[PDB]
Symmetry: C4
Subunit: 30 residues, 4 copies
Amino acid sequence: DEISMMGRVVKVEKQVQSIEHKLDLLLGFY
Amino acid sequence: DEISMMGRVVKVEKQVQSIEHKLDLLLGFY
Amino acid sequence: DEISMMGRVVKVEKQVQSIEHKLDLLLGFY
Amino acid sequence: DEISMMGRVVKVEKQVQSIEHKLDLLLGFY
């Protein structure tokens, strides 16, 4: 099921953005 | 093979959650 | 839509590379 | 193209494992 698949890809993308922002906090990038 | 593909996406999602939790530990978010 | 899907996968890949480079900065790998 | 797609997913998975190991280094998990 391609919608299920796309759903998981979109979820991963959002988590990945949130991860990058958290590292920007540790690094002092803003 | 779409099951193989979905399998890898699900695996990536779980690793990504585990990564976000580990950074929450470094950041002091709980 | 497979192009939309591929688009999101490529985006995730680029964010993931950028994340790995940022951690290389925290770790002192260069 | 599904092979191209699977190729990128596998690449992301490998980068994600490498990212988790790097954080294990910052956290002192071994």
